[PDB]
Structure 1
Amino acid sequence: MQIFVKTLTGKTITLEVEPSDTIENVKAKIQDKEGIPPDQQRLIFAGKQLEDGRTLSDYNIQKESTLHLVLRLRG
């Protein structure tokens, strides 16, 4: 399914994912498309930062949901 990731500069990137994917897997896809190391990525949905080892379905992230990406250092 398609989901969106929106950054602090307002940019949106579109990802093709599956509900069984982990948040780490989504970060790897962001690394594939955008060159950002997963350890420099924070993904936020429903107002909370998401844990790398849980799945999109664990967070009820649905088709056409928007995640928010915040970059940070260290890792």
Structure 2
Amino acid sequence: MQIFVKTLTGKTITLEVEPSDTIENVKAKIQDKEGIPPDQQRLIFAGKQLEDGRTLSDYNIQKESTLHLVLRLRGG
């Protein structure tokens, strides 16, 4: 399955995933392409902030859905 992640710079990431992939797995794929650790990743979809231990189908994310990647500051 194919989904999109939109960054604050206006770039679009193109990921290959499955509906059973966790939000943790997705952040790991985003790290493969962008080199940003999941630490500093934060995903938004359908008004929700996506939790790491849930799957894409839990949030009913489907093909061609666009996720929003934003900052996750631990305050430094």
TM-score (norm 1): 0.94
Q: Per-residue displacement from partner, 1:10-50 (whole Å, max 9, x unpaired)?
A: 11000000000000000000011110000100010002110
How many residue pairs are counted as aligned between the two chains?
75
Which structure features the higher share of strand residues? 1
Structure 2: which 5+ runs fail to align?
Answer: none
Question: How far apart are the structure 1 equivalents of 2:22 and 2:5?
Answer: 15
Corresponding residue of 1:40 = 40
TM-score (norm 2): 0.93
Structure 1: which 5+ runs fail to align?
Answer: none
Where does structure 1 differ by over 3 angstroms across 4 or more consecutive aligned residues?
A: none
State the 1:73 CA deviation: 2.7
Which structure features the higher share of helix residues? 1
Question: How far apart are the structure 1 equivalents of 2:11 and 2:22?
Answer: 23
State the 1:71 CA deviation: 2.1
State the 1:8 CA deviation: 1.2
